[PDB]
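Case study B.
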Amino acid sequence: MDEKYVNSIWDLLKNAIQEIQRKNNSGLSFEELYRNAYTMVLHKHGEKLYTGLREVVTEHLINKVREDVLNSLNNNFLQTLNQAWNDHQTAMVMIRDILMYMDRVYVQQNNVENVYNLGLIIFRDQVVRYGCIRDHLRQTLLDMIARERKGEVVDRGAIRNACQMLMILGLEGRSVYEEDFEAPFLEMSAEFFQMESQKFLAENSAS
Amino acid sequence: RQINTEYAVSLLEQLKLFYEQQLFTDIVLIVEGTEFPCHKMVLATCSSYFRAMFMSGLSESKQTHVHLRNVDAATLQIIITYAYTGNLAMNDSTVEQLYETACFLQVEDVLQRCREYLIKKINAENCVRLLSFADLFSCEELKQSAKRMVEHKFTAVYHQDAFMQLSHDLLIDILSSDNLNVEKEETVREAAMLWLEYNTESRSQYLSSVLSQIRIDALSEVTQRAWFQGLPPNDKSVVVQGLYKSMPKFFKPRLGMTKEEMMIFIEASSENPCSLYSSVCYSPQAEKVYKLCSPPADLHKVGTVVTPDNDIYIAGGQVPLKQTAFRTVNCFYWFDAQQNTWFPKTPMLFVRIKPSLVCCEGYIYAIGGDSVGGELNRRTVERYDTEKDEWTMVSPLPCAWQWSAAVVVHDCIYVMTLNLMYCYFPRSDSWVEMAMRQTSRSFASAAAFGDKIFYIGGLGSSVTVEIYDVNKNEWKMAANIPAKRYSDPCVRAVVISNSLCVFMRETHLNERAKYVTYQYDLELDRWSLRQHISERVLWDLGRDFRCTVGKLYPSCLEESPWKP
Amino acid sequence: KYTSQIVGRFIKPLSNAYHELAQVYSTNNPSELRNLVNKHSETFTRDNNMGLVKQCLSSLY
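Model:
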C-alpha cells in the first residue's frame, strides 16, 4: 500500500519492541505484532525492517547496557554483566520468535544471518568488544583467577556463567572466546607457573 | 531402531478419538465465532507458529481462549484434522487459501504437500495467477517452476486478465528474461504497451524501466508517439527523456526466434553399445544432427505427437523389468523445449505399446496400442485433456486393428489400417464408415497435408502411394517413388515447409544405409529431389524409429559428437 | 598395412561372394565348394572368366 501505512506499522512495532526491552512484556499483545510482521514482509519490505531492527537494537544497547556496565565497573561488575546478558537473552527470545518468521523468508532469500545471530553479533561488538569494557573485563578476570590460585576461595559459579556466556557469544564455535579469554590467561599462567617453578626448585628437592 | 508401527497407529487413533470426542481440551481456537477445541501438543507439532505462541511466555501462555484472526475456518479445520489424522484432502480450489494459512502458521509439511500439488497443477490458464501467488509468498522453487512455464505460456496467450495486475519487479524479470518463446519481437512490445496503458499515470515511472529491458529496434519506431498521445498533459520530463535515452543497452536478438522446422527422431540406433537406443534429430536448414534427451527410463515402443501449439508428448511404452525382459507401463511425459528434459504428467488408465498419438481440439488422442485388457473392446481409445490434466474415454472404434496409423484432418480423427478406415466425429462421439482401399498394406505411416490423407508405403515396405481425399471420399493412386531396385526403402511421411516431403532411407544389397529426402509435387504427382542427406553428419538410425514434424531451438540443444 | 584409402573400406562390403568363396575354400571341402559355386554361378559370371573358379577347385585338389 502507501508508504504512510507501512511507516505507521513499523513505528508501532518499534514502540512495541522498545516496550518489551524495558521489562514490560506483560501487557502487550503478540497476535497484533505477528499480523503486522505478516503484512510488513508481505509487501517485500524486509530490508527496511531488518535495517530498522539493527538500529533499534544497537541504540538500546548503547543507551542502556553500555552505560550500566561503565557505571558499575567496580560494584559487582561481573554480576551486572551477567544480569544484562540474561536480560538481553530473555528479551531477544520473543524478539527472535516474531522475527524468526521474518527470518524464514529473509535469510533463505537474502542469505544473511538470523536475528538471533544479529543480536549476538551486535552485543559482542558494542559490549564485550568495547574499547574500555574488554580490557576491564580481562583485567578483573585475571585478578580473581590469580587470587583464587593463591589459595583463598572466591566465587566459581559466576566464572562458569561468564565463560558460557562468551562461548554462546562466539555464535560459530570457539573462535572469539578462546582468543579473548585464553590468550591473556595463558600469558598470566605461563609467568605464574614459571615463577612457581623457580621458587620450588630452590626451596625443595626431588622428594 | 525404527519406532514401532503397531503402537504408532494405536496411539494415532487415540489422538483422533480424543479430538473428535472433546475431552482432554485445554486450548480452543476462536476463529470468526467458530469453536475449535484442540490441544497445545498437536497444534505445535505440525505448526512452527504455535510453538512460539504457547512456549513463549506471553499472555497467551496461560490464556485458554485465543482469537486467531485473518484465517479461514475451513482451512483451519483441514489443517487441524491433518495434524490429528494425517489425511490432507487437497482439491483443485482451496489449495490457494491452504497455502495462505500454511505460510501464516508456518506448517512445513503441508507447505511441501501443497507446493508439490501446485507444481503438478501449473498450466496455461493459471500460470499468471500462480506466479503472482509465488511472488506474494516466497516459494522460489514454485516461482522458478512457474516462471519457466509462465514464460512460454504468456507468449502464447498474452491475453489473460491477471497479467495486468502484476508487480513491476515481476514484469521486469519476465520481459528481460532470455527464455521467451516468440515468433517475433513485436508481440512482446505490444504486450508491454497494453500493460502500460492499462492504468493511469502510475505506469509512467515504470515506463522508464520497462523500455530499458526491451530491445531498441522498437524504441525509435512506432509505439513511441502512441505513448505521447497517452502522456499526462504538460509533462516535459518524459518526452525529452525518451528522446535521448535509447543509446545504451546493447541490441541483441532474443531466443524465441530460433524455432526451425526440424524432423524429430525417436528410438534411434545408439552410438555407444552400452545403451539400447537414443533420440536424435535432423536439421533440414542447418544440415546437422542435434542430439536429444533419452526417453524417460529408456521408454521404448512409444508414440509421438506435435500439437499446433508446437508441443511434444510421449505416451505408452514399455520399460525393461528389473535375455528378454520388458514390462509395459502407462506413464505419460511432456518434453521441455528449452530444458531438454521430459516432465512427467498424468499417466493413462491402460498401458500401451506403440500408441498412435493424435492431437485434435486441444485433446491428445491415443488410438489402440496393444492394450493389456483384451476384452470385447480390445481397443481402449481414450483422449487426454490439456486443460484439466486428465484422461477421458471416447467412443470405441468399430473394428479391432493392429499396427495402425492415425491422422487428424478437418477437426476429425482419421485412423488407417490394412484396408479399412473409420472417421471419428468428436462433436457427437461416433464413428462413420469411410472408403475402402484396394491394396492390403500394413506397417506404414501417413501424413496429413491440407485436406488430403497420403498413405505412403506399406506391406519391408514399398513405394506404393494411395492418396485419399476427405471432400471426395475416395482412394486413388498417383505414382510410385523412383528408388534403386533390389533395395528395402524405409518410408516416412511428414509435412514440412508447406509441402509433402518423404524421409526415405534405402539400403542396397550388402551396402550401408543411405539417407535422402524427396519433395512430392502435389499437382505434378512426382517426387522431386529436394535435398540429399550426406552420411558425414547422419549415421544409421535403425528400423523401429519414428519421425515427426516440430520446432526446436538449436541454442538449447547440443550437437551430437559422433564420427561420420 | 601401408594400405590405401576408402577403396579398402567399400570393396570388402562389395565383393562378399568372393569372400564367401574363400570362406568355404578355408573349410576345405571340394563337394561343398562345388555346391557353393553352383549356387553363386551367376555371381561369378560377371567376371569375363569362369575358368578361375575351376582353377580354384583344381588348386584345392
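Chain B has two domains: 5-136, 260-559. The remaining cases will be described in the next quarterly update.
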